Each structure stands twice: as C-alpha cells, then as structure tokens.
Design a protein around this ligand. Structure first.
Ligand SMILES: CCCCCCC/C=C/CCCCCC(=O)OC[C@@H](O)CO
Ligand SMILES: CCCCCCC/C=C/CCCCCC(=O)OC[C@@H](O)CO
Ligand SMILES: CCCCCCC/C=C/CCCCCC(=O)OC[C@@H](O)CO
Ligand SMILES: CCCCCCC/C=C/CCCCCC(=O)OC[C@@H](O)CO
Ligand SMILES: CCCCCCC/C=C/CCCCCC(=O)OC[C@@H](O)CO
Ligand SMILES: CCCCCCC/C=C/CCCCCC(=O)OC[C@@H](O)CO
Ligand SMILES: CCCCCCC/C=C\CCCCCC(=O)OC[C@@H](O)CO
Ligand SMILES: CCCCCCC/C=C\CCCCCC(=O)OC[C@@H](O)CO
Ligand SMILES: CCCCCCC/C=C\CCCCCC(=O)OC[C@@H](O)CO
Ligand SMILES: CCCCCCC/C=C\CCCCCC(=O)OC[C@@H](O)CO
Ligand SMILES: CCCCCCC/C=C\CCCCCC(=O)OC[C@@H](O)CO
Ligand SMILES: CCCCCCC/C=C\CCCCCC(=O)OC[C@@H](O)CO
Ligand SMILES: CCCCCCC/C=C\CCCCCC(=O)OC[C@@H](O)CO
Ligand SMILES: CCCCCCC/C=C\CCCCCC(=O)OC[C@@H](O)CO
Ligand SMILES: CCCCCCC/C=C\CCCCCC(=O)OC[C@@H](O)CO
Length: 511
C-alpha cells in the first residue's frame, strides 16, 4: 500500500528519537543542576527516580491513548495529537534545559505523547491492508523489528557522543528534530490512510464479562468478589495520602497495583456467575486472561532489572576505565546488537538443539529461564561493583558480560511473554493482553522506585554500611536475589499451568 512508507518513516524517526533521549537522560542528569540532592548516592537515587518515573508514564499512558482512539477519535487523530504533545515535550527540554520545572514538564509531555501513540502505531499500520491481505502486515512487522533495533543501536552510539562533545542542546536537540520529522512524515500521508470505524461495543467483551461477574448475585452467598474489589478501590484512594513520604508517581502506581489485584482477584472469585449472561467462550476467555495477568505479574521483576541498564548500569559505567572518546551511555548499544544476534541464535541453533536433545524449550520454560538469567546478569553487575569498591580498576568492556546475560534473558522472557499470552487468550481480546503487557513494565519500574525509597531509610542505610558493600553493590545483589525469587515463583506457577492454545497464527514486534 502506497501509505505504508509514511508509517515506516514515522516509526523509524520516533523510535530513534525515543531511545536517543532516554539512553542519555541519566548521564545528562547526574552532572546537571537539575538534581536537588547534594550527596553522590542520593543524586544516583534521584537520577534513577526521574528515569524510572518517566518509564512508568511511557508504559502507563497507552491506556489513555487506546481509550481515546477506540471510543472517540480513531487512531489517525489520536496519533497526530499525542505526537504534537510529544514534540512540545522535546521543545521543553530545549527551552528549559537549565530549569528543573520546565525540563520535568518536558519529560512529562514526552512520557504522555510516547505512551499515548504506543498501542496505536502498529494497529493503524495493520488497518492499511484490506481484510483479505491482513497476513501481508507480517512483512511490515518484520521491518519494525529491524527499525527498532538499528534505531536503538545507532541512537545509543551517536546521541551520547553529541552529549559528551557538543552538549545538551545538541544531544536533546537531535531526537527533538527527528520527532518533528516523524510527526511531519505521518501527517504527509494523511490523505492516503484507511481510517476504520471505532471498534463496536462488544456485549461479550472483557469489560462487560468482568462487570457481569462482579455485579451478578448468587442465592445464599452474597458478593465477596465485589467486596474485595470495593476494598481495593478504598486502599487505592488511601495511597494518594502517602504523597509526602513516597511522591505522587509511587502512590499512583501502588494504587494501580491494588486495583489490578482486587478487581482481578474479585472477578476470579465470581467469574462463574457470568456463565448465563455470556456465551462461555467469553467467560473462559476472561478466565484465561486472568491466568495471564498472574504470569505477567510474576514477570514484573524482569523489567525492574531490564530497565535499569539506562540508569544503574550507566552510573556504574561512568566510574569504569574507558578511552577519552568513549562514554558510559554508549554501552546501551549492546542490547539491540545482542537481540539481533540472539533472536536467530536461539531460533536457529539453541531451540532446535534443545528439541533434538529431549528438553523441549516450551514458552513457560523459556520465560522461567529468562527471569533467572536476568538474575545471573545482576550477579555479574554486583561482582563488577565489588571489584570497583575494593580499588580495582575495571574497564567498561566488563559490562559486555551482564549485557550478554541480560539480553539472553530478555530474548527468553520478553520476546516469549507476549506471544505466549496471545496463544492463550481469545484473539478478539488481544488489546487487553497488550494493555496488561505495557503495565508489566510500569509495575517493574515501580519496584525500582520502591527500592530507592527503602535504601534512603537511615535504618536500612546503617544495615548497608555494616554489610561491607557500597549502596550500589548492595542494590545490585538485591535485584539479583529478587529475580531469582521471581524465577522460582514463576516456575512453581508455570508447573501447574495448563496450556490451552487458541490455534490462531500470529510477531517479532516485542520491543
Ligand atoms: C499511574 C502512574 C502514572 C505516572 C505518570 C508519570 C508521568 C511522567 C513523568 C516524568 C517526569 C518525572 C519527574 C519526577 C521528578 O523529578 O520528581 C521530583 C523528584 O526528583 C523528587 O525526589
Ligand atoms: C513480584 C511482584 C508480583 C506482584 C505484582 C502485582 C501486580 C498485580 C497482579 C494482579 C494480581 C493477580 C490476579 C489474581 C487472580 O486473578 O488469580 C487467578 C489465578 O489464581 C489463576 O491461577
Ligand atoms: C553487525 C550486524 C548485527 C546484526 C546481526 C544479525 C544476525 C542475523 C542473521 C540472520 C539469520 C541467520 C541466517 C544464516 C546466515 O547467513 O548466518 C550467518 C550470520 O548471519 C550469523 O550471524
Ligand atoms: C550459563 C551462564 C553462566 C555464566 C557465569 C558467569 C556469571 C557471573 C559471574 C560473576 C563474575 C563477574 C565478573 C567480575 C570479575 O571477574 O571480577 C573479578 C576480577 O576480574 C577483578 O579484577
Ligand atoms: C553495538 C556496538 C557497541 C559498542 C560498545 C560496546 C563494546 C565495548 C567497548 C569498550 C569501550 C571501547 C574500548 C575500545 C578498545 O580499545 O577496546 C579494547 C578493550 O576491550 C581492552 O580491554
Ligand atoms: C568476538 C566474539 C565476542 C563475543 C562476546 C559475547 C559473549 C560474552 C563474553 C564475555 C566478555 C567478558 C568481558 C571481558 C572483558 O572486558 O575483559 C576485561 C578486559 O577488557 C580488561 O582490559
Ligand atoms: C518537513 C516539511 C513538512 C512540514 C509539515 C508541516 C506539518 C507538521 C506537522 C503536523 C501538524 C498537525 C496539525 C494538527 C492536525 O492536523 O490535526 C488534525 C486532527 O485534528 C484531525 O485528524
Ligand atoms: C516540577 C515539575 C513536575 C512535572 C510533572 C510532569 C507532568 C506532565 C504531564 C502529564 C500531563 C497530564 C496527564 C494527566 C491525564 O489527563 O491523565 C488522565 C489519565 O490518568 C486517565 O487514564
Ligand atoms: C560493532 C559495530 C557497531 C556499529 C558501529 C557504528 C559506529 C557509529 C558511531 C560511533 C563512532 C565512534 C568512533 C570514535 C573513535 O573511535 O574515535 C577515536 C578518536 O580518537 C578519533 O581518532
Ligand atoms: C544525526 C546527527 C548528525 C549531526 C551530529 C554529528 C556529530 C556527532 C558527534 C560528535 C563528534 C565529535 C566532534 C569532535 C570533537 O569535538 O571531538 C572531541 C575532542 O576531540 C575535542 O574536544
Ligand atoms: C535529522 C537528523 C540530523 C540532525 C542534525 C543536527 C540538527 C539538529 C538539531 C539542532 C540543534 C541545535 C542546538 C543549538 C544550540 O542551542 O546551540 C548552543 C550551543 O550548544 C552551540 O554549540
Ligand atoms: C496522572 C499523572 C499525573 C502526573 C504526575 C507527575 C508527578 C511528578 C512529580 C512529583 C514529585 C514528588 C516530589 C516528592 C518526593 O518524591 O519527595 C521525596 C520523598 O522521598 C520525600 O523525601
Ligand atoms: C543521516 C544521519 C546523519 C549523518 C551523520 C552520521 C554521523 C556518524 C557518526 C558520528 C561521528 C563519531 C565520531 C566521534 C569522534 O571520533 O569524536 C572525536 C573524538 O576525539 C572524541 O570522541
Ligand atoms: C535467593 C533466592 C533463590 C531462589 C532459587 C532460584 C533458582 C533459580 C531459578 C528458578 C528455576 C525454576 C524453579 C523450579 C521449578 O519450578 O521447577 C519446575 C520444573 O521442575 C518443571 O519441569
Ligand atoms: C541460577 C541459574 C539459572 C539457570 C536457568 C534456570 C534453570 C532452567 C530451567 C528451569 C525451567 C523451569 C520451567 C518450569 C515449567 O514451565 O514447568 C512446566 C512443566 O512442568 C509442564 O509440564
């Protein structure tokens, strides 16, 4: 279709721009006048707080983007308006580089813009193909895989060099211009796009079945699931009262986790009461979605460990030996390079080997192994830190070891997770699966924010100061242990999981 190049152009510029600004954020922040803390470990925590709060927004706002597009404006209009807000955020990073208030408004606008378009770009692309040629979108999804990885790789190698040698106006200015170009290119194909109707309200969709499950009465029982859901709404509201000691972003996230557990768990309790009102394939479909929500919840520590390569690992990298021309942030280029090497290594070498050897590399085995390997990566990061803390000069090339381990974990759990959930949930409920997957990253980033608060406590600080390890080394070993515990909890849940496939072919678009 003649409109597809405008979509490819917009996707390439926006992805390069996103990774470009995100992957220099902590290195820019740590030497800036934008941090209010004065002590070195307090400033590390503050820079992590900003990055991980930004990641929270990026992966939470798809909820708003999808809702506005599906219920009111369609995908084209929603993409355009979120992309312009996105541009305004990039312009704020320019207009307010030396202003804490303006630069944070800029990050807020970028998070909102990037988050809002995220569940829309891929869906709008598929809409461009006629209903009998939907399978041909696979070729474009394959191009998105290469575009995301090459864009992330180049952004990680180039933008930190612009920061180091040219300064912040150039380093944030380049992604800003690319986002303007991404928005302009999307707009240039406007007269050629297919603009499909708003999705019809499904009387047997996820929301309707949850509504019927919670509200339906049963003789001589009552409604304890609705009660649990009501109590979770009250506990979520109580969180807004902890803004003083935890900050608004943590409070809003803890409230989100409470609402997911209470309403989800409450729906699980009374889901059988929907069986009459709904066609069974709808009720079973919601049961399958709730089992997926548990699998996704258990994967959140992987994202706690994964998203810290742009914060905690950069901060470590800065203290390591390197040539004058190199900068710590450039190490982030190893992740997309390793994804591009390891996706075909696992697909063409490792999985076929394992299959021939008798150990079937099932989707749940890959996921358990994936969380465990992210834990192993953090044992390596911590061991590197312990060598650094003991006065040993460590070359930054030592970070290749945890990058390899972590990216191996990513290919095993992150690339598998979404494909696994799609295979188990009804294909008509794919949007719900995706919303829960985005929230998996939001929740993993919350665990990082919570760890920052926990270490700032004078009692925890004294326990750390007595442990012998630095705050960074303690936190690294803590995250490794957290991933190992998560791998164990995931594996025990996976053991009792019954695979019930939908038998509908689907996907290299996981990042
Ligand atoms: C349900 C969760 C929604 C969260 C929305 C988050 C919106 C994104 C914001 C990115 C900018 C982060 C600025 C935070 C910040 O610097 O806080 C001040 C902090 O340094 C004090 O410790
Ligand atoms: C390591 C952190 C794990 C907790 C993450 C919290 C995110 C929220 C998750 C929703 C709660 C689980 C849903 C409960 C539910 O429906 O269970 C059904 C389950 O028993 C099916 O086997
Ligand atoms: C510096 C290049 C980074 C990107 C690496 C991409 C690796 C993907 C290769 C495609 C699948 C293997 C096809 C068979 C083949 O010719 O393998 C040789 C070589 O590509 C193996 O890395
Ligand atoms: C199946 C994959 C297994 C991978 C095993 C490796 C996992 C990590 C182990 C910790 C070693 C981290 C490297 C740090 C190190 O060697 O520092 C000591 C020394 O070199 C300091 O001069
Ligand atoms: C996708 C490409 C990523 C490129 C960066 C990651 C590879 C590691 C680089 C370490 C910093 C540059 C040092 C170059 C150099 O002289 O290397 C020799 C060094 O390995 C000896 O220890
Ligand atoms: C040419 C093939 C390279 C394959 C690399 C990917 C597999 C992972 C390897 C682990 C590398 C460990 C780090 C080695 C390192 O930095 O040594 C320390 C040395 O640079 C000190 O000068
Ligand atoms: C590089 C040279 C080309 C310059 C292109 C200039 C236009 C740039 C960006 C798009 C502006 C969008 C303005 C808002 C708009 O059209 O909204 C329509 C919306 O309300 C309904 O779909
Ligand atoms: C000291 C500077 C603080 C900077 C704070 C940054 C805030 C920036 C952007 C957020 C824009 C408001 C979006 C809120 C909104 O309408 O969300 C509705 C949504 O929660 C419904 O799901
Ligand atoms: C593993 C290969 C990945 C692709 C590499 C793409 C290269 C793009 C950007 C980074 C270039 C950095 C080169 C800087 C450099 O070597 O400077 C040395 C300096 O002393 C001048 O001689
Ligand atoms: C897509 C962006 C294109 C425009 C920007 C291209 C420039 C990229 C990176 C900066 C290169 C370093 C410039 C030379 C320089 O000052 O070297 C540092 C040092 O040798 C002197 O202080
Ligand atoms: C589209 C990709 C290629 C990008 C090429 C470079 C043009 C992009 C952005 C322009 C940024 C200009 C920043 C001007 C500025 O404030 O300079 C002040 C000072 O830093 C001068 O060195
Ligand atoms: C619907 C989303 C709206 C956007 C929300 C954006 C929130 C942005 C910034 C909040 C900054 C909180 C500052 C307070 C804080 O965290 O203080 C540190 C605390 O540990 C007390 O020492
Ligand atoms: C279409 C995109 C714009 C085309 C421009 C691509 C620019 C590619 C690479 C940037 C040059 C990196 C070289 C950095 C370098 O060696 O700096 C000097 C050195 O002494 C300090 O790093
Ligand atoms: C510091 C906490 C350590 C906790 C132990 C971590 C062990 C590492 C990875 C988890 C492996 C999977 C757990 C066992 C499991 O579920 O096995 C089921 C399997 O036998 C079915 O074939
Ligand atoms: C600390 C070293 C970590 C190394 C990687 C972790 C160990 C490797 C594989 C464990 C996979 C357990 C998966 C459990 C699972 O899905 O069981 C379901 C199965 O029993 C259904 O028949």
């Amino acid at each position: 279709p003649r409109q597809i190049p405008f979509i490819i152009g917009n996707e390439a510029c926006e992805r390069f721009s996103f990774y470009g600004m995100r992957n220099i954020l902590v290195q820019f922040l740590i030497t800036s006048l934008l941090l209010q803390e004065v002590g070195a470990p307090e400033r590390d925590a503050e820079a992590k707080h900003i990055l991980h709060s930004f990641m929270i927004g990026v992966f939470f706002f798809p909820l708003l983007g999808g809702w506005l597009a599906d219920r009111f404006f369609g995908k084209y209009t929603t993409i355009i308006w979120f992309s312009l807000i996105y541009c305004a955020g990039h312009a704020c990073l320019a207009l307010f580089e030396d202003s804490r208030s303006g630069f944070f408004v800029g990050l807020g606008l970028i998070a909102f813009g990037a988050g809002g378009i995220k569940p829309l770009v891929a869906s709008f692309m598929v809409d461009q193909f006629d209903q009998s040629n939907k399978h041909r979108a696979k070729v474009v999804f394959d191009a998105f895989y290469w575009i995301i990885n090459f864009g992330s790789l180049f952004a990680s190698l180039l933008i930190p060099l612009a920061l180091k040698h040219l300064g912040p106006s150039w380093a944030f200015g380049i992604p800003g211009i690319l986002m303007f170009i991404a928005t302009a290119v999307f707009w240039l194909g406007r007269k050629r796009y297919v603009r499909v109707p708003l999705p019809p309200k499904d009387p047997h969709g996820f929301g309707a079945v949850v509504r019927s499950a919670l509200l339906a009465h049963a003789p001589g029982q009552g409604r304890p699931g609705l009660a649990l859901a009501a109590i979770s709404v009250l506990l979520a509201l109580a969180c807004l009262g902890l803004t003083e000691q935890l900050g608004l972003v943590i409070c809003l996230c803890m409230a989100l986790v409470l609402l997911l557990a209470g309403i989800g768990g409450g729906t699980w309790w009374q889901l059988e009461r929907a069986r009459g009102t709904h066609p069974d394939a709808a009720v079973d479909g919601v049961r399958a979605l709730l089992r997926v929500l548990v699998i996704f919840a258990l994967v959140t520590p992987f994202f706690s460990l994964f998203d810290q390569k742009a914060s905690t690992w950069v901060l470590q990298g800065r203290e390591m030996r390197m040539p004058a021309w190199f900068t710590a942030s450039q190490m982030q280029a190893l992740n997309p390079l390793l994804v591009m090497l390891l996706i075909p290594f696992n697909n063409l070498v490792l999985y076929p080997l394992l299959r021939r050897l008798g150990w079937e590399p099932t989707s749940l085995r890959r996921m358990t192994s994936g969380i465990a390997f992210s834990g192993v990566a953090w044992i390596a990061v911590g061991a590197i830190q312990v060598a650094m803390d003991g006065g040993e000069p460590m070359h930054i090339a030592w970070q290749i070891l945890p990058y390899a381990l972590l990216t191996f974990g990513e290919v095993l759990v992150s690339a598998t997770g979404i494909e696994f959930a799609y295979s188990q949930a009804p294909p008509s409920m794919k949007g719900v699966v995706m919303s829960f997957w985005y929230l998996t990253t939001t929740v993993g980033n919350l665990w990082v924010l919570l760890s920052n608060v926990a270490v700032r406590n004078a009692t925890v600080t004294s326990h750390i100061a007595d442990t012998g390890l630095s705050e960074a080394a303690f936190l690294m070993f803590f995250f490794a242990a957290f991933a190992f515990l998560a791998a164990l909890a995931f594996g025990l849940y996976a053991r009792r999981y019954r695979m019930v496939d939908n038998y509908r072919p689907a996907n290299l678009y996981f990042q």
